[model samples]
Each structure stands twice: as C-alpha cells, then as structure tokens.
Target: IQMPVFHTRTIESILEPVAQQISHLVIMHEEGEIPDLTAPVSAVQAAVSNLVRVGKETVQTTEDQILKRDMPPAFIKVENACTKLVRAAQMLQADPYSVPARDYLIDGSRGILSGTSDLLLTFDEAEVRKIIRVCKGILEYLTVAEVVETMEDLVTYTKNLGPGMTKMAKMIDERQQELTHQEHRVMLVNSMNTVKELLPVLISAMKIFVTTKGIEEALKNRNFTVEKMSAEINEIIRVLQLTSWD
Candidate 1:
C-alpha cells in the first residue's frame, strides 16, 4: 500500500515505480490473469528506461569515483534481471496462463527486486561515506584546535572551523529529515546544540589564557568543556553513521 523510501529522492523515485510494477506482476500472477500483456510490458519497458537514465546521470554527476564505478554496473544487474521478466511477459502474451511463463515472471520479478535492493543499498552506503568523510575531517580539525598558541591562532582557528561546521551541520540537518525516527533525530539535534553552545565557552577560555599569557586558571577548567564538545561532535558523527539515520 505504501511506497518504500530511500535516502535520496532520486533513488526513491527510481525504485517506487519499479517496485509497484513488480508488485503488479505478483498480484496478477495470484489474483487473476492479465487481460493484456501489452500494457504491462510497456509499463516495465518504461520503468527500465527510466532506471537506465537515472542510473547513468547519477553515476556521471556523483562526486565519488567508487560510486561512479559501482553504481553504473549495478543498473546492469536490474536490467539483466528485468530482461528475463520482459521476455517472460512476452511469452505469456502467446499463452496467457502458461505455468512456465507465469512462473518465470514471478521469478524474474523477484530477481529484479533483489537486484534493486542490492543496487540501492550500494547507493545508500556511498551517501553515508560522503558524510563520514566530512565527519572524519572535523574530528581531525578538533585536534587542530587544541594547540591554539595565541589569540591570533584562536581567532583563525574558530574561523577556519566555521566552514566545516556549516558543512557538517547542513549534512546532519538533511540527514535528520531522512531519518524515520524522531528519537534518532532528537539525539542528532541535541549533539549539534551541545557543540554549538560549548564552542563560545571554549573560545572564551582561550581568550582568557591569551589575555593573561597562560596565567588564567579557568583555561585548564574550560578545557574540560572543550573535550565535551569534541565528544558530542563525535557522537553526531556516530549518529549519522548508524543505519538508523534512515
């Protein structure tokens, strides 16, 4: 009754009709005979064409080369499996209820289903990796911020951090919309807010030290908050990494 979803609209749009058409094949196999194979065949042919176009465009525009190498060939699996289903349907036009034709149609439908699952999961993992790469950069950047030796260095440090912060936050926000669970999203926003709130505190501590030439005691005390910020950010990375991001 409900269309399944994926992380990206491109993937969901590509799969939804394919999934529906496959379901139709299964329904026809059980509930009643197909009145005419013409419409069914044409529908699948169109789905296959759309699949080809989307797959090609996705591979071309994608930033990840491994994705480029991976996704294009994945379309072939669906097409190859779909070919059997199409041929089976064409055979069924010759004999509407031939068991072999119907059976192969069912089998072919499943083959396409399985292949679609495989291909889309590949796309999903590729997407997750892109987010992980940013998370990876920021974690290393957190270490970079630890060694700010001057107010000059701290000023440049937080400024440099701003771009990636903007990038990763946008990434997380989009990912929150993708998540099916409100609970996971709440955790995501919480982690982001924790880091956002503590950032100024850490900067203020740095300023205290720079102003006092390392004489301020609160610098040591506030480094604890700095570590907490890093931990919360790491938690954000883990939240995005989990399959629960949906």
Candidate 2:
C-alpha cells in the first residue's frame, strides 16, 4: 500500500480474487477420500483450463516480434504450473491435509500470476511511451499559443496547429480509460479542463490586445494563461508517467 505502483485495477480486480478462489478450492477439500470426488476435481480442471488455454494463445501467435522474446520462458510457466497443480491433486487424492501438496499448488498459482504481471507491465509500458511522444510534439506546437501578436498570426497558428490539439484531446480521452486510481484520473481531468477553459479566454485576450483597446497588463494575463496551459500539459505528462508506475 505504501508503494506508488501503477494501478492494475484494469486486470487487477478480476485476477486478484482468482488466486484466492483457487486456494480455497484446494484447501477446502472437505469431502474425505471415500467421498465422491467427481464435482471437486472437475472444477479444478474446468477453471485451470479456462485461464491457461486463453493465455497460451496470447503468447503463441504474436507476429509483432516484441512479445516473441517473453513468449518462451514466461509462457512456459502456465504449462508447468498446470502440471504442478494437477500433480498436487494427485497427492491430495490419497493423502488428507497434505501440506506439501498445498504448497505446490500455491507455488503453481503464484508463478502463473507473477509471469502474467510481468507480461502486462511490458505491454502497458510501451503503450504509455507511445502517448508520451505525442505530448512531446504537442508541446512543440503549443508555442503557437504565444505567437499571436497579429490577426494573421492567429489564423496561421490555428491553421497550422489545430489538428495537433484535436489529436492530443483525443489521446487524453483515450488514455483516461487506463487510469487506475480515482486521483490519477482527476489529475488528467484537471489538466484537460485547463486547456479547454483557458484557451478561449486567451484568444479573446488576444483580440483585445490586437485592437490596442487594452493596457499591457491585459496581454500579461493572456501570456499567463499560455504559461499555465503549458504547465498543465507538463503535469499531465508527469501524471502519465507516475500514474503508470510499476
């Protein structure tokens, strides 16, 4: 809880309980050796097959070559864990309250979960990096926000860089889906609101300045908005990195 790790509330919530559920099924095997074992054993086979089979395919056919490296050893964990789990059942079939049997199954389960955590971190890391590059370009184009000393400059700035703002806005919304914590999501929203709320005011402040109807102080506040907008963008970049922390 003290650790500032990336919130996996995406894959986390579902996978979180699965390990516990599997453990319960293993340890709560109350029916004795003489009791009918069909129902209990079938559950193990069913649940284990569901997760392992689907996971196998994800690592198997990624022609992208990025996961091809992780595919080998991390991929092997599932098959091995499945075997150890079933083998653990073999021991428990005859033995009652077998501690070693329980430990092996626990090891199998944790190995599966840990390997999955590593794979997820790998993919998400790259996903965050891709968006960071977009922010990098957006910051470059954002200087256009300040180059508005003349009416022609306003037209030129929007024409040349408007698409970038749209691109970034779209990205901001899409990545908002990835946030793990409520506070991190709010951090993104706050930054997003700054650009939307302040830019129009800055544009009008521009109109006021261009007409020479206002004092230099009017331009000063406009520049401050531009300044704050860029600061907000940088904060989002900071949010994206740390909020995605592993």
Candidate 3:
C-alpha cells in the first residue's frame, strides 16, 4: 500500500489468476476427460448457459440499483462491489483470447458475479471496515475530508500522470440548472450522478484486499472518479418534499 504505486502491477497480476483459471479449464476441456455424471451432456450445457445468463442479469441489476437516484442501503455494498467487479472483468476480458479463451473469461466473470449476493449478506462487518480504510487512506493522501474539494484541489495541484481534462464546465452547467429551479433539484441530480461515479471505485478498490490485489490496484491505477453523491441525493429528497408544499 505505498501511495506512489497503489495500483502498480495489480490489475495485470489480478487478471493472472483469472487467466490461469481459464487456462486450466481449457486444458481440462481439451483433454476430453469429462467427469462421469448422471445428467446428460445437454443438461450440463444448459445448466452452464443458464448460470452465465443469471449471473449477468444479477450483476446488471445490482449495478443499476447501486447507481440509482434513490439508492437503497440494505443492498448498497453488494451493488457497489458487483458494479466494480463487472467493470474490472470487462477490462480484463479484452486481452488475448482464443475462442476457447474468450469463453473461459466469460465463465470466470460469471463465477465472480455469482458469489456477490451471498458475500454481501455474510460480510457486512468486513465490508464496512474496508470502506472506512479506503476513505481514510484517500483522505490522508489528500489531507482533507471534504473529498470533492480535496479531490478538485489535488487534481488541480498536480502534474497529472496523463492528459488532463476538466469537468468543471459540466459541473457548472448542472449547478446552473439548479439555479434555474431556485429549488436546487438539479444539484440533487448531479449529486446522485456524483456518488454513482465514486462509490463503486472505492468499493472495487477495497475488494482487492480480500480478493486479488491486482483488481484493486488496477482500479486505483485507472483514472477513476468517486463523488459522494449520496448525501447530495438525500439533501435533494428533502428539497423535493419542501418544494411539493410550495
């Protein structure tokens, strides 16, 4: 966890496990050493297909809920983790892939997606701790708890690692929309969008501590954003109720 190289060598390394697992599967399939089963081969194939489809749907559902304007807290951690995991899976799946290799990558992602719900139910304590650590670590790195302010200043103050871009114009635009309403509903929308961006990055980053450090590091290494949009949404929800009376 040295700050200078928080993500260095992690993504590549995390994918290595997935790659190795895929390779083993390929070898097994190639060997034609099918396990003896009471079920027919067609039944097994159908089961595999169904499992993959179910995993994909589950991942997408969790992602949508996690990023929704009105996010629910009960499933929050699980949704956050799955969103990041799926994104990481997509990035890793892009590499060297023979047909068999591609199938293996898909299968592996399905496996990752498959276990998230159970973990969320079972590991609430650990999940909260990880979130706290990452937030604190980031705060320490920035020396500020008002994360957006710190993040804005940090990005502005640094000679970034790559070509720099600005979202200030967009932020300004959204803020202006809020001004137009005078009621500030737009700010709430922007706030929701903001958290929708940041929480998954934080969730995904911590996932590295328990799983492959590579995925965590990769998320850190990537140019990612995490805006604390939740409170903003909450604030707006309050605003909405107040506006309703007007």
lDDT of each: 0.75, 0.68, 0.39
Best candidate per TM-score, number?
Answer: 1
Which is better, 1 or 2, measured by TM-score? 1
* Candidate 2 ranges beyond 4 A from true positions: 1-8, 22-80, 89-98, 144-153, 204-222, 243-246
TM-score, every prediction:
0.79, 0.66, 0.20
lDDT tens per residue, model 1, 1-246: 764455455566666676788788788768876576667766876886797798888888888888888777667777876777777777877987577878777776767766677678777778878888987787788776658778889889889888887898888888777775577789998888777787778778777777777464866756787678778877887776665426
Q: Write the per-residue lDDT of candidate 3 for residues 1-246, one digit (tens) a residue.
A: 321211113333433465456557667656643122223423434544454465455555653333222223323433443444344344444643334444543454444433332333223323223333433343343322123223344344333311111232233344334322543546545654664465445444434323442554544433243223334434443433332235
After superposition, which runs of candidate 1 have C-alpha atoms over 4 Å from their true positions?
1-33, 38-43, 53-65, 214-216, 244-246
**Candidate 3 Cα misplacement greater than 4 A, ranges:** 1-183, 212-229, 244-246
The order by descending lDDT is: 1, 2, 3
Candidate number with greatest lDDT = 1
User: Which whole-number lDDT from 0 to 100 does residue 174 have in model 2?
Assistant: 81
Backbone clashes (count) for model 3: 2
TM-score of 2: 0.66
The predicted structure with the larger TM-score, 2 or 3, is 2
lDDT of 2 by residue, 1-246 (tens): 242344556667656676567657556654432343445655755765665566568657554355556545655665566666676777777785677876776777767666566656656655676677787777777666666778788777767666766777788888787667778778888888888787677677777776664458777877787778789888888888773434
Of the pair 2 and 3, which is ahead by lDDT?
Answer: 2
